[PDB]
């Protein structure tokens, strides 16, 4: 009944921006990190960014660094991306992912299906 | 200024006993109550005693970790702090700590010595067995098996070889002796004509290796 | 207050 | 005994930002009877703030405390070069005094995912009856991983130990080494030796393996 759920994808032009969000039933996510992957076309998956528990940090892929904010609601059990500045090399299908192991390990057991991003 | 200087330390088997002396300079050292702290290899902090002034009574407190083994005790005509270690487990192995207790209502610890290591094992002076951690960029390193005591030195290359160099902590096993691994990564282009020698060096057992890392047959 | 085993600077 | 629990357990931040500590306590403690002291690598401890607020001898302004009750925090307003170490809180109010876990000041950067490499016992380890299986996690960032050993597809638990390096002065990554330790006979009964790595920056787990006798 753990079920992740990505949305807020679509299509902007380079230089926009776009606020994904990814929906957790079934569990409260205080206790996780969520992390945000992509993949772009051809491609392996590829990380982008993690927000860990609350007073816990933010950390980032040196390709998105100083672009991409990541963000959590705890109380809407909800994490979030911020994309600014975006470049056609950003076009993916972005995935949100619970870390598993509370120890920041990267368990990832339990993944949405994706959102698209196009940027052209 | 305060001086705070920690002996007595060093290896001893468990059962035995061993005192720590800490000797005090550039303070009145009788109207100050000294505290001794400890701390584990690779752990945090433990509180192991006070001792209060003379004038408050020199009586002493200890927790319950060390409470009938460990006592605190003083010299204030020679400006010395003592701590009678008794009944000696593996775990009391950790750096000591001499400390002074500031005067007044807030008794932080405001200043610490250079710290004295204790070593509780029954296991007996060993030189260590160097194994090749050889390539199949790529890693290569050396495995530094079954030595005790700590410490033991590695270079590489007689120390002309530093980057991408990583030397780790050594682990102790459950046999009492100790095992730490050397690795560097190097170009997998330069493989065939470079020699790579990781230079061990373990002082305690006058044990010094050359071993040269190759790629397998 | 303060639990007299816990001050080293009066004597219990 | 007053519990003293200090988060984060690690803080990455970048040199000039600001940095705040938390100390919480599992009951009620005076600020009187709260400190804060600083251990560099290498070194022993050295008190910085005492009475939850007031300022230790020689310590520079930026360092500054707060808090009352359960919660008491440890601001240092610019991160210094000098200031990347651990930081401990104590209570000396309640028997037995009582020391937090500590917090680690790391310098931040961007997600490195480790490069894994296995290592098989040597041959000449092996003549004398027993076999060490070494997997290197090289240069990753942040510092959380782990390491699965599995020996024909069996997760082995309770038979292997890591360590870890001090953040690299240079790229500010760290590396980690994990031993699988065996018998000859135990080594010389499988053939499929491999340890899964697992990272924060790794979508699925890398694993690396050898055939033994290959």
Redesign the interface.
Same mark, same amino acid.
């Given at each position: 009944x753990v079920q992740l759920x990505x949305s807020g994808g679509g299509x902007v032009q380079x230089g926009x921006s776009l606020x994904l969000s990814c929906x957790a039933x079934x569990x409260x996510x205080x206790x996780x990190x969520x992390x945000w992957x992509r993949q772009x076309p051809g491609x392996x998956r590829e990380x982008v960014x993690x927000x860990x528990x609350x007073x816990x940090x933010x950390x980032x892929x040196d390709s998105x660094x100083g672009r991409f904010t990541x963000s959590x609601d705890x109380x809407x059990x909800x994490x979030x991306l911020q994309x600014x500045x975006l470049x056609x090399x950003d076009x993916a299908x972005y995935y949100c992912x619970x870390x598993x192991x509370x120890x920041x390990x990267x368990x990832x057991x339990x993944w949405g299906x994706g959102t698209x991003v196009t940027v052209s | 200024e305060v001086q705070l200087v920690e002996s007595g330390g060093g290896l001893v088997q468990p059962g035995r006993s061993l005192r720590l002396s800490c000797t005090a300079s550039g303070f009145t050292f009788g109207d100050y109550?000294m /505290?001794w702290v400890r701390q584990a290899p690779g752990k945090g902090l433990e509180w192991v005693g006070?001792?209060? /002034?003379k004038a408050? %009574?020199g009586?002493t407190?200890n927790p319950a970790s060390v409470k009938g083994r460990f006592t605190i005790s003083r010299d204030d005509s020679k400006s010395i702090a003592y701590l009678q270690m008794n009944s000696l487990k593996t775990e009391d192995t950790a750096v000591y700590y001499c400390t002074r207790?500031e005067? %007044? /209502?807030s008794?932080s610890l405001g200043y610490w010595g250079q710290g004295t290591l204790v070593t509780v094992s029954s296991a007996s002076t060993k030189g260590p067995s160097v194994f090749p951690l050889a390539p199949s960029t790529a890693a290569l390193g050396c495995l530094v098996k079954d030595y005790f005591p700590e410490p033991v030195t590695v270079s590489w290359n007689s120390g002309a070889l530093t980057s991408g160099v990583h030397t780790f902590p050594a682990v102790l096993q459950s046999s009492g002796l100790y095992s730490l691994s050397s690795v560097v990564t190097v170009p997998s282009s330069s493989l065939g004509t470079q020699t790579y020698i990781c230079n061990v060096n373990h002082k305690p057992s006058n044990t010094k290796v050359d071993k040269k890392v190759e790629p397998k047959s | 207050?303060?639990?007299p085993?816990?001050? $080293?600077?009066?004597? $219990? | 005994e007053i519990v003293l629990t200090q988060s984060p357990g690690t803080l990455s931040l970048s040199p000039g930002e600001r940095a705040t500590l938390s100390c919480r306590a599992s009951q009620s403690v005076?600020s009187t !009877?709260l400190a804060w002291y600083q251990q560099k690598p290498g070194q022993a401890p050295r008190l910085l703030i005492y009475g939850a607020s007031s300022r230790a001898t020689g310590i520079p302004d930026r360092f500054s405390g707060s808090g009352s009750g359960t919660d008491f925090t440890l601001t240092i307003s610019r991160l210094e070069p000098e200031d990347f170490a651990v930081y401990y809180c104590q209570q !000396?109010?309640?028997?037995p005094?009582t020391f937090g876990q500590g917090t680690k000041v790391e310098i931040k950067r961007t997600v490195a995912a480790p490069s894994v490499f296995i290592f098989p016992p040597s041959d000449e380890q092996l003549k004398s009856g027993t076999a060490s299986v070494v997997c290197l996690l090289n240069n990753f960032y942040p510092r959380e991983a782990k390491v699965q050993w599995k020996v024909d597809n069996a997760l082995q638990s309770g038979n292997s130990q890591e360590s870890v390096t001090e953040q690299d002065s240079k790229d500010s990554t760290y590396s980690l080494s994990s031993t699988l330790t065996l018998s000859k006979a135990d080594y010389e009964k499988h053939k499929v030796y491999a340890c899964e790595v697992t990272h924060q920056g790794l979508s699925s787990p890398v694993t690396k393996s050898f055939n033994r006798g290959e």
């Open positions: - | 109550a /505290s006070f001792i209060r /002034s408050n %009574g009586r407190e207790v005067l %007044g /209502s008794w | 207050n303060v639990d085993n816990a001050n $080293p600077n009066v004597d $219990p | 005076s !009877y !000396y109010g309640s028997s005094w």
